[PDB]
C-alpha cells in the first residue's frame, strides 16, 4: 500500500499532498478520481496525482 513518488510535485491546494522524489506515502489508496490517490506523507493526509507516484510493494 506504501508507494514511492519519484517527482517534485508541489501541493497546489489544501487537500493536495506534496510528493517529492523518494518520498514514500503511507497507506496509499486509489480514489474515485482517475489518477488521484490518497495517502499519508509528512504526517499529512492528502491526495496526489498518480503520474507522480509509483507503487512499491
Amino acid at each position: 500500500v506504501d508507494y514511492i513518488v519519484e517527482y517534485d510535485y508541489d501541493a497546489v491546494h489544501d487537500d493536495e499532498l506534496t510528493i517529492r522524489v523518494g518520498e514514500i506515502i503511507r497507506n496509499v489508496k486509489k480514489l474515485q478520481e482517475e489518477g488521484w490517490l490518497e495517502g499519508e506523507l509528512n504526517g499529512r493526509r492528502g491526495m496526489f496525482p498518480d503520474n507522480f507516484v509509483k507503487e512499491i510493494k
Binding site: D8, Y9, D10, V12, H13, G35, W36
Partner: protein, 76 residues
Amino acid sequence: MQIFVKTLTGKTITLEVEPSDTIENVKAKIQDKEGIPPDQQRLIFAGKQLEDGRTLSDYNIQKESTLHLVLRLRGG
C-alpha cells in the same frame, strides 16, 4: 503533435496542439471539446502548474505527453 490529458472523472482527452502553442490556447481547445471553463482548468505537468502565459516549449512538453487536469480545491 497530440497530447493526453488526465481528467479527474476518468477520461483521457487527447487534444491537438503544437510546441509553439500557448497554454491559454490549450485551455480554449478544452473548453471547446469538453466545455470546461479555463478559469476552472488547472493544468499540471512534471509537478509544476502550466502558466496560461507560457507555451509548451517552455515546459519542454513534447508529443505523447501526459498532462494532469485538476480542479480548484478538490473535495472528492
